[model samples]
Target: GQSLRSFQKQNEDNDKRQQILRSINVNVSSSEAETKYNELIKEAFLVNENGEKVEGDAFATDVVKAATEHQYPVFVANVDGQPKYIMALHGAGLWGPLWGYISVDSDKNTIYGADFSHQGETPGLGAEISKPVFSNEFKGKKIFMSGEFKSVAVVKPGKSVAGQDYVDGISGGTITSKGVDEMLFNSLSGYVKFLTSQN
Candidate 1:
């Protein structure tokens, strides 16, 4: 089986429409991480077994299961210590990858913290998402409305406000910002009940 690095490299330019795949980077010594990362392509629709590419859910049950088994740091945002959020990564625009950690308050229906990453989001632009300046906006934001799930919005620049359920889009990275918005809201939607249980 190919290594995780191999898989990431093989699929680095796989997404033609969005060009989201980028090299994988992790500093874990676990053999299991290596094994899982290698075989991930087989099980991951994100990268087809035959090397064909497709859009795979970043939160696929198997992925989460594997992460849980390896104890790969997942938490809910907003609560005080010890696992308050479940952060993860996903593909993004311009042939890059985006990732983030989201902390849900004990209420699970609200956001407590959020931070994102990118393989090549432009500096001083989309790169802002990775900064506390952008991510800090998510602290203490609610994720629900009238018992329904509502993911965070990616607003255009100068369009966001404190305490609102949205963040100002990156100044020069509209597509990347929208991609993160979709990735996050879609990814977080499934945890409503799980989040509520924590409240």
Candidate 2:
């Protein structure tokens, strides 16, 4: 019974990982992607506040730490030989915690795609953050503007004044909308050094 449950969970996790890769436009077979994912996770490393590598088993600690402690974790992967960086984002929503993943191009500035989820956001308002309409707006946005790290913003609909760095926030969900804005900028700030180094 335990073995069967473990096997099921493994399959679920594998499927989830593959789904995330696909969301970011990674066009590889599941088997090949799984292999690549394994290699990337093992090869991932952690960075300190100073943006220097900590030099230890990051896969074992950082990944788990991100999920358990709400700390951001960065994972690098190669898709069809092109490098992509996946970053985890976590923050508090209007009702509870919110989390998401953002995949960026090798430029380390342009977003390739994003996936978001919330623990307890309102169904039609704040919950829209998990929808494609919101996430898709991030696809072409640049985190760095004029060579400065100016993170993306989710502003009130029709109030987004900036180009490429702003997206329309969900109507009536100002608080939750701003939560995502804070999450993106704050969480991603932790990876500034590593991202800049990739350029």
- lDDT tens digits, residue span 88-198, model 1: 444465548776656554455566556576778778777877666777666666777666677778899777645437877778878888888887765554444444453
Q: Which stretches of candidate 1 lie over 4 Å from their true place?
A: 1-83, 160-164, 196-199
The estimated TM-scores of all candidates read 0.56, 0.78
TM-score (C-alpha, index-matched) for candidate 2: 0.78
Overlapping backbone residue pairs in candidate 2 total 0
Cα lDDT tens digits, model 2, 1-199, are: 5798887866766655654564475545655766756754434566754566665555345343553543345667776677778876778789998877788987888998888778899999999998888888889899999779889989889876655489899998999999999998888888787788742
- Name the candidate that leads on TM-score: 2
Against the true structure, candidate 1 reaches a TM-score of 0.56
- Which prediction has the highest lDDT against the true structure? 2
lDDT of 2 at 63: 42
